[model samples]
Target chain A: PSIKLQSSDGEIFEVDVEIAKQSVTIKTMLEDLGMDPVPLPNVNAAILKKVIQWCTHHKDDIPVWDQEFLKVDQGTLFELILAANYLDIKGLLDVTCKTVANMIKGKTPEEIRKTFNIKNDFTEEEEAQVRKENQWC
Target chain B: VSWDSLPDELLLGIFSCLCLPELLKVSGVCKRWYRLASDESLWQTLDLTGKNLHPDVTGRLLSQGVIAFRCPRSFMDQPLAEHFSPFRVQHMDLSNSVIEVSTLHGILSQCSKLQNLSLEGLRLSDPIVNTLAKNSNLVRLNLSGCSGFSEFALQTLLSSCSRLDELNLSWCFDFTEKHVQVAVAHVSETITQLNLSGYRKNLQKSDLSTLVRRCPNLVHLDLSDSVMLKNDCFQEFFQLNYLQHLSLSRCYDIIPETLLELGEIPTLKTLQVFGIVPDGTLQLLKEALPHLQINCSHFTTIARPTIGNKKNQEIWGIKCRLTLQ
Candidate 1:
C-alpha cells in the first residue's frame, strides 16, 4: 500500500509504503493506528518531496552516517535541516544538524549572521557591549 | 517557524548538544528562541575548554544562561576567574595547561555535584589536594602526572573520598610507599581500578602483595616500566584471583621463573610481558595456563637446535602461538 502526503504548497506526492515508513512520523501515522495521507503544514512541497526522495534512496542503508555526511553549502543545508526535522527522519536530522553546526563551528557572530542571511539585530552600542562582555572568552 | 511552536522538550534536547557559543547564537536568532534557549537547564554542562580561543566573545556567550562549566587550563588565569564566579558549575576537566593550584580550589568549591574530575599535567599543590579531599562524593579522580601531591595529600585523599572507584596516580613522582600503604589500608577496598605507573621505583613486592591481598577485587593493574620490581613480584602477583589484565613490560629482571609462576593464575586472561624468555618458557606457560592469552613484543637471546636441521643451534626472535590441549 502507498501513502499519500500533502506538502504546505499543495503538492501531493505518492510514496511507496516502505519508503514513507522510513520517517517515524509517517510510519507511526500509517502503521500504528492506520492514519494515511499525512499532511506536513510547515514544509513546502518541493522540500518535502526532496526529503522523501532522499529517505527512499537511503532507506535500506543503516542510518549511521559518517561525521562528514552533510558537508555542503549553508543555504541548501538549512533547508535540509528544516525538512529533516519536519519528516522526523533521525539520520537526516542528525546529518543536517551536524552540517549546520559545522558551518557555524568556528565562525564569528558577524560571519554566522552573514552566512545565514540573518540581519544584525543589535544596535552599534549593543554590539559593542556584547563584544565587551565576552572579552574574556 | 516560531520557537514557541516547537516543543520545549525538543528544544532542550537540541540545546543540550550545543556548546556555549552555539547556544548564544541560537538564543540570539529570535526572541522566542532566545527565551527558550536561555533556560538554566539548557546550559548545564558548559564546556569552557576553548574559552581562550576568543575569550571576549565566549565570555559574553556565557552571560546568556546558567551552566555547569568545564574550563580549559588557561581559564585558570587570574583574570578569567571573575567571569566564572557568577555561575554554579558541576563537572570539570582541567587536565592540560598551566593553572595555579589556588584558583582550582576556589572554582571546585562552587560545584556541589562535582563528580568526575581530571587534573592531568597540572602542577597541583597540597592545598588543592586538601580541598579535593573534603569533597566526599568525588567518584573518578585522574591525578596522572600532577606532581604536586605529596604523601600527605594522598593520605587526605584516602581519608576523604569514600566513594572513589578509579584513581590514576601515573607519573606522580612524589607518591611513595607510604601513600600506597595508606591507600591499601583505607581506599583500596573501594577502588576497582588503580594505576600507579611512571614511578622511579617499581612497587615493592611486599607493598603489591599487601595491596593485592587487601584489594581483592582489582580487575586492572598497570606496573609497566617500573624498574624496582623483580621476578619474585610476578610470582606473588599470580596468586591474585581478581587480576584479569596485567602489564609488566620493561621490568627487565622478569625471567622464566616469573613467567612459570604467572602460568599458574587461571584467572589471568590477558598478559603483556615484553623481553626475552627461554625457548620453552612460552610453551611451558601455554601448557600450564591453557585459557590464558599472552602478548609478547620481543624475544631475546635463546639458543635452540633447529627442528629441521642437523647441526648448529640457532638464536631467533620467535612470535609463535602455542595452544595447549
Candidate 2:
C-alpha cells in the first residue's frame, strides 16, 4: 500500500508506503488508524517534492559525510537543511547541517557575516569590545 | 535557505564533526548558522597543522571553545605565544619541527592539562627542562636526539616527571654517570621502560645493581654499548624477575657466570647477548633452560635435536663456535 502526501501548493504525490515512512512525520500519519494523508502546510509544493525525491534516492544509501559536503554556496545549502528537517529525514538533515558547519569552520567574523548575509546588530563600541575580548585567538 | 529554518537538534549534530576551518565557514554563511555552529561544545578539538598564519588563529579557535589542538613546527611562533596558555589541552604533539624557546615556555606555563608530550628532534634549551620540572602533570615524555640537553636536564626531568612511566633518552651523549644515577634514584619507582642505549661510558656495577633493585617493575631495559659492565654485574642483574626483555650487546666483558644467572629466571624467554661465553656455560644453559630462546653472537651453535618415542620430546645440544675477541 502507498501513502498520499499533499504539499502546501496543492500538488499530491503518491509514494511507496515503506519508502515514504522513512520520514517520521509521514510514518506516524500512516500508522494512526484515523489520520488522513500527511499535509506539509509549512513547506511549499516545489520544496516538499524535492525533499521526497531526495529521500527516495538516498533511502538505501548510507550517509557518509564530513566538512567536504558543504562545498556549495551557503545560501542554498541552509534551505535544503530546513526542508530536510521539516520532513523528518535524518540522513538529509545530517548532510545539510554538516554542510552549513563547514562554511563556518575556518572563516573570520567579517567573512562569516558576508557569506551568510547577516547584518551586524552590534553598535561600533560593542563590536570593538567583542574584538578585544577575542584578542587571544 | 537560512539556518533558522532547520530544527535546533539538526544544527547541533552538524557542528560536531566540523574542523576549525569548516566551522569558520559555517559561521560565515549566516547569522543563524553562526549561532548554531558557534556553540561552545563544537570547537573541542582544534587542528592548526599547516596554517602558518598569526597566533590569533589559536585564540580564535579557542575563543568559541576548543579543548585539544594539533600544531606543526611552522605554525608555532613567539608572537602567537599567548595562544599556548590554555590548560584545557589534554594531549599535544610538537615533534619533527623547529619551535622557538620562548614559545615552548608559554606552553609549559599555560597548558596544565598536558598529559603526553613528544619533543622528538626539537631544539630544546635549559628553560624547556625547567618548565617540565615545574609542571608535574606530565606522564610520558620522549626527548630523543634533543641536541641542546646535558646531564642537568636529565636530572631536572627525573625530578619533575615523578609520575612518568616511559622515558626515551636514546642518542643523548651528554648523559654522564651522575645523570644516570639521578634517573635511577628519582624515576625507578614508577618508570616501567628505560632506553639508555648509545651511552658509551662504562656503567659501574653498583649503579646497575641499584637500578635493578629500585626499579622492580621495570619491563624493558636497553643497555646497549655500556662496555663498562663486568661479568659479575650481568650475573647479579639477570636475577630480576620483573625484567621481560634485556639487551646487552657490545659489552665484551661478559663471562659464563652471566649465562648461569640467566638460566635461573624461568621468565627469561628473550635474551640478546653479544660476544663470547664459555662452552660449559652454553651447554649448561641449553640443558637446564630448555624453555629459553637465546640469540648470541658468533660463539654458540645449536645442534640438531634427537628424536624421541613420544614424538613431541626432543633433546638439544650446543656446540662451541669461537672465543670472544
Best by TM-score: 1
lDDT of 2 by residue, B114-218 (tens): 555556556776777766675567666666556565567767767777776666655555556776676566763677667665565636667787778777766
Relative to the unseen true structure, what is the C-alpha lDDT of residue B94 in candidate 2, on a scale of 0 to 100?
55
lDDT of 1 by residue, A24-48 (tens): 8777878667766577787787678
Clashes of each: 11, 24
lDDT (tens digit, per residue) of candidate 1 on B35-77? 6666766654444443343433334334444333344354445
Off by over 4 Å in 2: A1-93, A99-117, A120-137, B4-84, B147-157, B235-239, B249-265, B268-325
Report the backbone clash tally of model 1: 11
Report the lDDT of model 2 for residue B20.
40
Model 2 residue B13 CA deviation in Å: 4.5
Docking class of 1: incorrect
Per-candidate TM vs. native?
A: 0.64, 0.61
Q: What's candidate 1's DockQ score?
A: 0.17
